[PDB]
């Protein structure tokens, strides 16, 4: 969650204030995937070291 | 946890307002008087040695053209760009070496303390303002800040509607009282880099 | 049957950090560290 | 100055940033740019990062120094329009979400075209993570873009 | 500042009931309670 | 045979390389019939048009 600070102002006497509600946001992060493959032959796996 | 979060937001707003108005306040209407605003047009304003150029001699001129009664009780205030530009004055390697890259911001300049204020002007090239006040030195005991009440918050329990009946809403009121101005304007030396159109 | 909502994606727990991230620059000022401060008991202060 | 790198840019990346983020930040670049920085001072002026014979300094302007080879470091033999060479900001606003470490599995039998045993084997592996920037205003990035 | 998402609606915790609710009728059958069960070993059972 | 569930470790793709999915296979075998049809009496309500 993210937001900001409310906005103040220099007001005079008997002066109505203004609405100062802040805005809210939702930073988001997806999770992705990576992969790799190595094939081999049945001869190599028993002949190589 | 709405209440604590919004209290934190109120504190941030108060700081973000007051720190700005202490530097650049109109001084008329409902705003207090800022320092650079009260030092504008007064004998405190001087000009660089060469037009439209911030050189090494300009800092010295600002330090010099102020009387010794206040010069021994002064302090520096500027933006970070000005301090970095002063840092970049030395190339040959003597008598201009404030510090070397790889070190923090030095705490003294010409033997006096150093402060910073983000609300001051930054660049005289990209900005369209004719007046760019970038350096300040003077006795800051002549700038008075009068404060009356701290930051207080009151809880409104019932807001009303068009026909003067409750609508189911509650409120949070806050207020703050302060005032400031200059007393003696001849104890400052503000440098102005006027860019001609 | 994957991560899409209609294919079982309704069963993944929701994750959230409640702490708030302020995204306002703010400002730093040191005038208060050098200036002269006085208590006021009215609407004006004289001298 | 376009198509140029100088001490002014190194300062500027640091300057043009709010104090709240500047007081806590770090430098990220490539070793070639760091050597370029090392060769700015010839007469021992204000650019004296270090003298030849000493390793890589760990601090610049009082802030930590880091290296990352994946960023480009030259704009002459390169042909891309933009070259982002330097970076400085608060890195606590860059979140690296980590889910599962590397795992390796062994497939005992691989298949051919007509779905019959082929006479081969394999090794499978996978890895999951996620990363992004939360607040994009807590950084500054230098771009010496090559004019065409 | 109401319950709208952009007006503070992101702070309300998400509530979920993990248990699944089967929405299929099924069938109740009792032949296996009365019928006769034997074990087979090949493809066919002869008597 | 009762209900048996087998866990396929790796499903493959179009080009005969693993695609990153797993499987769940189940089966059972049974059979039934009537040995004597005179032990029952079924009722049929032939509701023709």
Query: B191: which residues sit within 8 A by CB, 6+ positions away?
Result: B45, B46, B47, B48, B58, B61, B62, B133, B134, B135, B136
Residue F37 per-residue DSSP state: G
Return the partners of chain B (3 or more C-beta pairs < 8 Å): A, C, D, E
Torsion (CA) B14, B15, B16, B17 in degrees, nearest 10? 50
Query: A19: which residues sit within 8 A by CB, 6+ positions away?
Result: none
| Shortest CA gap F4–chain E (Å) | 17
Resolution given for this structure, in angstroms: 3.4
Measured in whole angstroms, the distance separating CA B165 from the mean position of its chain's CA atoms is 47
Return the H-helix or E-strand segment holding A44: helix A42-47
Q: Are B109 and B99 in contact (CB under 8 A)?
A: no
Which residues of C are less than 8 Å from D137 in CB distance? Answer: 23, 25
Handedness of CA B179, B181, B183, B189 (dihedral sign): positive
Flag if B93 and D61 touch (Cβ within 8 Å).
no
| Shortest CA gap E1–chain A (Å) | 6
Map D67-126 to HEC letters. Answer: ECCCCCCCCCCCCCCCCEEEEEECHHHEEEEEEEEEEEEEECCCECCCCCECCEEEEEEE
> Smallest Cα–Cα separation from B122: which of B112, B135, B106?
B135
Flag if A37 and F18 touch (Cβ within 8 Å).
yes
Query: SS3 for B15?
Result: helix
Flag if E35 and F32 touch (Cβ within 8 Å).
yes
For B58, B93, B94, B100, F27, the CA distances from D45, given in Å and listed in that order, are 21, 4, 7, 8, 83
Handedness of CA B113, B118, B123, B127 (dihedral sign): negative
| Measured distance CA(E44)–CA(F35) in Å, rounded | 14
CB atoms inside a 10 Å sphere around CB D60: 20
Which residues of B are less than 8 Å from C35 in CB distance? Answer: 140-141, 143-145, 180
Dihedral-angle region of residue D119 (phi above 0 means left; psi in -120 to 50 means alpha; beta otherwise): left
| Measured distance CA(D61)–CA(B85) in Å, rounded | 14
Which residues of D are less than 8 Å from B98 in CB distance? Answer: 46
Overall residue count recorded for chain D in this entry:
148
Q: Are B155 and B3 in contact (CB under 8 A)?
A: no
Q: Which of D10, D15, D59 sits opposite B80 (nearest CB)?
A: D15
| Measured distance CA(B197)–CA(D73) in Å, rounded | 39
Q: Are D131 and D93 in contact (CB under 8 A)?
A: no
Any idea what the Cα angle at residue F34 is, between residues F28 and F39, rounded to 5°? 145
> Smallest Cα–Cα separation from C28: which of B105, D108, A15?
B105
């Amino acid at each position: 969650v993210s937001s900001a600070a409310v906005q103040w102002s220099w007001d005079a006497e008997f002066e109505e204030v203004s609405d100062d509600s802040p805005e809210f946001g939702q930073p988001e992060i997806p999770v992705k995937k990576a992969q790799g493959f190595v094939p081999i032959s049945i001869e190599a796996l028993q002949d190589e070291a | 946890n709405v209440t604590e979060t919004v209290a934190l937001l109120f504190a941030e707003g108060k700081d973000e307002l007051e720190a700005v108005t202490l530097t650049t306040g109109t001084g008329q209407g409902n705003q207090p008087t800022g320092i650079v605003t009260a030092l504008a047009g007064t004998a405190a304003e001087i000009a660089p040695v060469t037009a439209e150029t911030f050189a090494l001699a300009d800092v010295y001129a600002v330090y010099e053209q102020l009387a010794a009664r206040h010069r021994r009780q002064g302090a520096w205030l500027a933006n970070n760009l000005i301090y970095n530009k002063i840092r970049q004055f030395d190339t040959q390697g003597g008598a201009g070496l404030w510090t070397t890259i790889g070190n923090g911001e030095p705490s003294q300049l010409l033997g006096r303390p150093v402060g910073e204020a983000e609300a001051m002007d930054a660049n005289w090239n990209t900005s369209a303002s004719a007046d760019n006040f970038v350096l300040l030195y003077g006795n800051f005991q002549n700038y008075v800040i009068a404060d009356r009440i701290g930051m207080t918050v009151e809880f409104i329990p019932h807001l009303f509607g068009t026909n003067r009946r409750p609508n189911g809403s509650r409120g949070w009121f806050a207020y703050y009282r302060m005032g400031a101005d200059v007393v003696n304007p001849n104890a400052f030396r503000l440098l102005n880099v006027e860019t001609a159109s | 049957m994957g991560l899409t909502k209609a294919d079982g994606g309704y069963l993944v727990p929701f994750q959230l950090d409640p702490t708030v991230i302020i995204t306002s620059n703010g400002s730093l000022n040191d005038i208060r560290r050098f200036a002269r401060q006085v208590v006021a008991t009215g609407d004006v202060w004289h001298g």
